Each structure stands twice: as structure tokens, then as C-alpha cells.
């Protein structure tokens, strides 16, 4: 016969409201954090909303549900691409589980700092508050990438000549405590 | 628009691949793991029922195959099939002419 | 990713992002944060806490992720 499942277990929310009651409608606007500009969801965004990631034929019932079955109910066989897709789903799940386990072991070992972001992010973004009180070619490559992407701009030498080891200190005389100055 | 503002959680929806796909007994206190470790360990298609066999519709790798010529192992295991001078082939390290 | 310098490509490779339209899951460690900060103009990042992920997948609350990681081969 015919099969229609949007979930692994087949369960779902009540598709229809109670008789005589106002229904619930999804958010028509694109999920943009700023209140403006307001834009209606595109068809691709509606597909993402309904669960088909991006285009049709991907991560949805149109791909998960069996393509056919025998008239006596006998199911089809396992295709190589079907096994590959099962392995891909397992790979996503393994990525999630391993990332979560890494976070848990970092928190257990105490490697998660109390200050949000990295030092480069703190030196760049002013919206963050101030918190006071084998082979080696690949290693050299990582070091030079860090040296090139750490400080995108330098303090002008007219203020503090970095060749003499002179650095400027944070002058927070005109700062503000409320984040609205950067949010608005 | 090509600048789409949707939660990237939707880019990989887990609605059809919950944790029970990996751990079928996770709803109980058991943690039997059942994964497809890779795409390489695919033994092939198998018939679910005897009444519905798989079709014989060849592929290119399966059909475009010449006939078998007796090799060194075959001729060493059974010397009865060494019947022609063409069987006496040189060392297999020899590819051929340039 | 290939439209940019090789260093941004190396950061995206560390994030395991090879082509446009690929999705990966990573921890919230400072290394990953630094990589995402360096490639913050080519990627879109969503955040899910540990409890939110435990709810998203079908796993009870008394089962952590370390035991699942030790179980998976």
C-alpha cells in the first residue's frame, strides 16, 4: 500500500485543531535575528522547515521511505547507495556523540575557560566585557597560519612602537556597561 | 534569495535518524551498538524471501569479462589442464612490450 | 572555500568543511571557537547545548555521551 512518515517512529503533532478553534500557523518570515528587514520564507526555507534539507529528495520521507514493495507485502532489497546513506546518517550521529563527549571530558578535566571566546576574539570584538583578575612541517604551517591570522591590524608605531616592545593599555574612560549600545 | 536565514540544525535533520538507529536498545538500560562502520563493508543485495529472487541484469564490471586463461597457480595445482603451448606463460611480473 | 586563501581553506579543512553546502558537528572547545572565528565569513553556526542534543536525539537523561562514545567502535 502507501506509506507516509515524517518521523522515524511515525508519530507527529496533531495535524488538525479541535473543531471550531483557531489553528496554529508557522512563522512566515525568515528566521533573521534583526527585526528588519522582514522577508517571507522562500521555498527552500519552507523545505528546511518541513524537514527536507534544502532540495527535495534529501533527508526527507521522499528518500527514507521505500520506493516500492511487492503486492504480497514483501519489501525490497538493500541497495549499495541505501547502505551508504545509512552509513552517512550513522556518521552524523557519531560526529554529534563524539563532539558531545569531547565537551564533557573537557569540562571534567577543567579545560573549558570561564571567559567566552578566544584572545583574538576578545582583542577584536569590543562587545565582549573585560575580564580582569614524525614530521614538523605541519606544525610550522599551523604556527605560520596563526601568526598570519592572529592580529589582522597592528597598533600604529606612532602610538606604541612594537619593535621596542611598547604596547598600549585599554582606555575604558568612555566605555558603557549596557550592551544596548552595540545591540541597537 | 540565496542568503537564507534558517537554523542550520535543519540542514541535517535528525527526525529520521534518532539514537535508536545506533543503539536499538537505548530506551532500555542496554547499550548494544549496531552501526554501519563504513560503505566498504557492504556484502551485497540479499533476497528477503525465496519467492522473490533478485533479477539477473548484468553490470558493466560483471559482464565485460573475457574468458579465463589458466594461470601459474591453476597449472601448478592441476597439471592436466596444461594442454597447449600458450599455457606456458612467462613470469607474471612481465607486463609486456613498451 | 577554494575562492579564498589557503589559510582559510586549512581552517575549514580542520573544521572538516571541504565544499560549499557541507555540514559538520564540532565541540565548543577554544580551538574550534578560534577556527570558527577565523572563518566566520564563510560558515553559518548553530549552537545546541548538551541537554538540547540529548533531547534532539533519542537518548535518556541518565545516559551521558562519554559512555556512548566508548561504546561506538
Amino acid at each position: 500500500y502507501s506509506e507516509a512518515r515524517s518521523n522515524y517512529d511515525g508519530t507527529s503533532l496533531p495535524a488538525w485543531p479541535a473543531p471550531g478553534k483557531k489553528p496554529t500557523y508557522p512563522a512566515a518570515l525568515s528566521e533573521l535575528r534583526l527585526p528588519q528587514p522582514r522577508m517571507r520564507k522562500t521555498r527552500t526555507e519552507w523545505m528546511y522547515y518541513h524537514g527536507h534539507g534544502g532540495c527535495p529528495g534529501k533527508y526527507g520521507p521522499s528518500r527514507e521511505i521505500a520506493d516500492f514493495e511487492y503486492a504480497d507485502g514483501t519489501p525490497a532489497s538493500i541497495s549499495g547507495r541505501r547502505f551508504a546513506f545509512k552509513h552517512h546518517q550513522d556518521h552524523l550521529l557519531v560526529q554529534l556523540i563524539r563532539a558531545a563527549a569531547t565537551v564533557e571530558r573537557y569540562d571534567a578535566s577543567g579545560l573549558l575557560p570561564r571567559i567566552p571566546g578566544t584572545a583574538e576574539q576578545r582583542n577584536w570584538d569590543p562587545a565582549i566585557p573585560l575580564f580582569l583578575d614524525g614530521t614538523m612541517v605541519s606544525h610550522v604551517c599551523s604556527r605560520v597560519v596563526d601568526e598570519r591570522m592572529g592580529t589582522p591590524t597592528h597598533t600604529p608605531n606612532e602610538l606604541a612602537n612594537r619593535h621596542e616592545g611598547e604596547t598600549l593599555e585599554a582606555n575604558t574612560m568612555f566605555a558603557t556597561n549596557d550592551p544596548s549600545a552595540f545591540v541597537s | 534569495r540565496y542568503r537564507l536565514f534558517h537554523p542550520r540544525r535543519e540542514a541535517i535533520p535528525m527526525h529520521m535518524c534518532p539514537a535508536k538507529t545506533i543503539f536499538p536498545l537505548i530506551n532500555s538500560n542496554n547499550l548494544l551498538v549496531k552501526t554501519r562502520n563504513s560503505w566498504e563493508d557492504f556484502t551485497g543485495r540479499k533476497e528477503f524471501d525465496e519467492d522473490h529472487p533478485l533479477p539477473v541484469v548484468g553490470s558493466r564490471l560483471n559482464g565485460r569479462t573475457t574468458q579465463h586463461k589458466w594461470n601459474h597457480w591453476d597449472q601448478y595445482l592441476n597439471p592436466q589442464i596444461t594442454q597447449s603451448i600458450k599455457d606456458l606463460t612467462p613470469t607474471p611480473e612481465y607486463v609486456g612490450m613498451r | 572555500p577554494f575562492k579564498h586563501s589557503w589559510e582559510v581553506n586549512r581552517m575549514l579543512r580542520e573544521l572538516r568543511l571541504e565544499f560549499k553546502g557541507q555540514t559538520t558537528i564540532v565541540p565548543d572547545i577554544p580551538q574550534v571557537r578560534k577556527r570558527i572565528w577565523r572563518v566566520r565569513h564563510i560558515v553559518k553556526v548553530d549552537v545546541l547545548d548538551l541537554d538540547e542534543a540529548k533531547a534532539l536525539i533519542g537518548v535518556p537523561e541518565h545516559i551521558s555521551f562519554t559512555d556512548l562514545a566508548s561504546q561506538l567502535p
Binding site: 551508504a84 552517512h88 | 560503505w39 566498504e40 557492504f42 551485497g44 | 572538516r16 557541507q22
Partner: peptide
């Protein structure tokens, strides 16, 4: 170039995937 296998990768066709038949008992015995 190395393969990260981040996206969905279709399996490869290899002779080990041949559909092997089932050993059947003879009809007499």
C-alpha cells in the same frame, strides 16, 4: 587530495557484493 567523507558518498561497486546463492539440499536425500 584526501577525502573527508563529510557529504553523502555513494558506495563503490566491488565484486564482493555479488549475490551469492544458497546451498540447497538435493531433492533425493
Amino acid at each position: 587530495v584526501t577525502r573527508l567523507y563529510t557529504s553523502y558518498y555513494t558506495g563503490v561497486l566491488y565484486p564482493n557484493q555479488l549475490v551469492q546463492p544458497k546451498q540447497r539440499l538435493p531433492a533425493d536425500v
